[PDB]
């Protein structure tokens, strides 16, 4: 998908048989995702960005469908108020930041 | 520039005659930036992202250079641990997320 910039590149991603609005964030390095029900192996950790640091669950190997395009990746599930398709997923769909 | 080196698209940016590392944050909507010196003509705003809410200074019309590309935009100055380049600047360099 080609996303210009006059709007947000949000996409109903499908992770853990679930569906939520995602926020393509080339700023983050992985795919964080508000807490939710996600079965699979995960590692507990804490990301520190703006405002403070939260807790997450590095879920490596999760099929996240972005815009209808299959894309597995590591989804860090934590108490984040949003979804973040970071580099770990911008490399699965083969994104290119051209300007 | 077309950047497909599946890596952090960072760029030495020049803001207020200064220089810091910028993290192309297509996830954010504007160009936040750690504390620094800007031209009187800003407005206080609070961003609430991961971990908590921080306070910045929405500076408008700041010649922020990205990778040597003269660009002006809204640079928020606050206690952020990074130079965030949100869409507000991804619209100046005509960025496009093709995947
Ligand atoms: O905390 C944010 N992280 C933190 C973060 C850390 C680690 C990961 C996983 O690797 C993902 C995100 C990033 C910006 C950042 C990176 C590094 C250091 C400091 C900041 C992100 O790249 C940005 O997109 C939003 C994500 C977001 C947006 C809305 C709601 C929740 C989360 N934020 C917060 C943010 C909010 C507003 C603006 C201005 O509009 C900018 C940033």
């Amino acid at each position: 998908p080609q996303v210009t910039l006059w709007q947000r590149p949000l996409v109903t991603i499908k992770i853990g048989g679930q569906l939520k609005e995602a926020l393509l964030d080339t700023g983050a390095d992985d795919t964080v995702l508000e807490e939710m029900s996600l079965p699979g192996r995960w590692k507990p950790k804490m990301i520190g960005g703006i405002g403070g640091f939260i807790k997450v669950r590095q879920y490596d190997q999760i099929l996240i469908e972005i815009c209808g395009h299959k894309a597995i990746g590591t989804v860090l599930v934590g108490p984040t108020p949003v979804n973040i398709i970071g580099r770990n997923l911008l490399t699965q769909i083969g994104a290119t930041l051209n300007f």
Side-chain angles (χ1 to χ4, degrees), chain A:
Chain A
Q2 182 227 129
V3 160
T4 48
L5 42 278
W6 303 115
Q7 247 92 326
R8 313 148 156 157
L10 256 131
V11 327
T12 302
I13 62 170
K14 217 208 233 190
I15 275 169
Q18 242 64 89
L19 285 169
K20 289 209 287 202
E21 314 264 70
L23 195 64
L24 297 193
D25 187 9
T26 326
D29 290 289
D30 254 294
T31 297
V32 121
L33 250 86
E34 168 191 346
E35 236 160 325
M36 54 202 250
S37 195
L38 181 53
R41 327 111 193 278
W42 53 280
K43 321 217 140 112
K45 42 209 297 317
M46 269 208 140
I47 39 155
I50 292 152
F53 345 123
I54 65 165
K55 244 138 82 85
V56 315
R57 318 206 259 253
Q58 159 141 288
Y59 269 108
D60 312 87
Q61 313 236 25
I62 301 283
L63 183 269
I64 176 194
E65 202 176 324
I66 277 103
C67 276
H69 297 223
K70 159 156 187 220
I72 286 253
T74 313
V75 211
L76 297 102
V77 187
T80 187
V82 118
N83 336 48
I84 318 283
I85 288 37
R87 268 190 331 124
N88 73 308
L89 264 279
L90 292 158
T91 57
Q92 299 290 169
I93 37 139
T96 78
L97 240 81
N98 325 152
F99 9 96

